[PDB]
């Protein structure tokens, strides 16, 4: 009784299945992010002491802009800044929302969580990774032409390794997705595993693992955004 996967609120539409729980978690994360954005919009000031939300947002912007400037000049690739900031905040909020105590007994002795981190669903990570993939490949095409960019990526650094280079490209999105998936998917299992204990024993491993999971979510958001920025930099260098 571990019930791995088994999405809830699953509904069909236009002949396509949809995981209601994943959509709901993503929508809650987006609502939190948009609320933070519009709360900054109402309290963004340069002539006074900044608020906490302004400090958080500008720290994120400073970090992402520093990474971009280090890798690819902000003149060439300005959009990468909002892209990376959005990716980071989205992943971080979605991962950290799992820390809340929303696990219970699903009337059958198996743990059920009202909110599950959307990154534990392959659809979420695939959407993010493929959006990034298309984004920086389009950027590279614009930078180096329709035919120039594919030739450059195939040739890589030494032409004699042309096969591996191709694989590397295919590994860029997959590595971005699976990594995140795993780092969050494992969490969804461990908590479930820890739910097999009695409460008086379940409380302690649950606390330890969920603290470590807070750390893991922070690191995963950081890595995903940084690798996105650096893939843009690689794809946009002449």
């Amino acid at each position: 009784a571990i019930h791995v996967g088994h999405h809830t609120l699953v509904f069909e539409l236009f002949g396509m299945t949809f995981n209601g729980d994943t959509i709901l978690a993503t929508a809650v994360t987006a609502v939190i992010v948009i609320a933070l954005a519009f709360y900054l919009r109402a309290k963004v000031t340069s002539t006074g002491v900044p608020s906490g939300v302004q400090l958080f947002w500008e720290a994120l912007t400073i970090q992402m802009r520093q990474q971009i400037e280090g890798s690819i000049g902000m003149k060439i690739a300005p959009f990468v800044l909002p892209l990376s900031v959005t990716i980071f905040v989205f992943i971080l909020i979605s991962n950290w929302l799992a820390v809340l105590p929303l696990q219970y007994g699903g009337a059958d002795g198996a743990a059920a969580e009202l909110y599950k981190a959307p990154a534990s669903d392959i659809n979420f990570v695939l959407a993010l990774a493929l959006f990034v993939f298309v984004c920086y490949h389009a950027a590279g095409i614009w930078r180096r032409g329709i035919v120039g960019h594919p030739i450059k990526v195939v040739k890589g650094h030494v032409a004699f390794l042309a096969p591996i280079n191709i694989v590397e490209e295919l590994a860029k999105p997959i590595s971005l997705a699976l990594r995140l998936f795993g780092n969050i998917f494992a969490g969804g299992i461990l908590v479930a595993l820890i739910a097999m204990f009695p409460w008086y024993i379940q409380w302690f491993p649950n606390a330890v693992w969920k603290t470590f999971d807070l750390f893991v979510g922070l690191i995963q958001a950081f890595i995903f955004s940084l690798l996105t920025i650096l893939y843009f930099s690689q794809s946009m260098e002449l």
Partner: protein, 84 residues
């Protein structure tokens, strides 16, 4: 005998192999990255903040493998491909 029995035994062995390999890789890689971090901090103490950005990047690239392996291990033992 029951085909699912041997299929599940093979799935459990394969998942064990996946998890063991992932654990070996992640443990050793994290140890090596942490060794680099500790040595760098010992040499020039004021680089502590400066070295954390690459270190975690390394931790991101190393642990990935393990966690990716972990995911597939679940697929082996919870939704076994080829199960009859």
């Amino acid at each position: 005998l029951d085909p699912n029995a041997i299929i599940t035994a093979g799935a459990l062995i394969g998942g064990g192999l996946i998890m063991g390999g992932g654990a070996i890789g992640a443990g050793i890689g994290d140890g090596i990255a942490g060794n680099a971090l500790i040595s760098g901090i010992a040499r020039q103490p004021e680089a502590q903040g400066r070295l954390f950005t690459p270190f975690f990047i390394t931790v991101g690239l190393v642990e990935a493998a393990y966690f990716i392996n972990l995911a597939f291990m679940a697929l082996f033992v919870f939704a076994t491909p080829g199960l009859q």
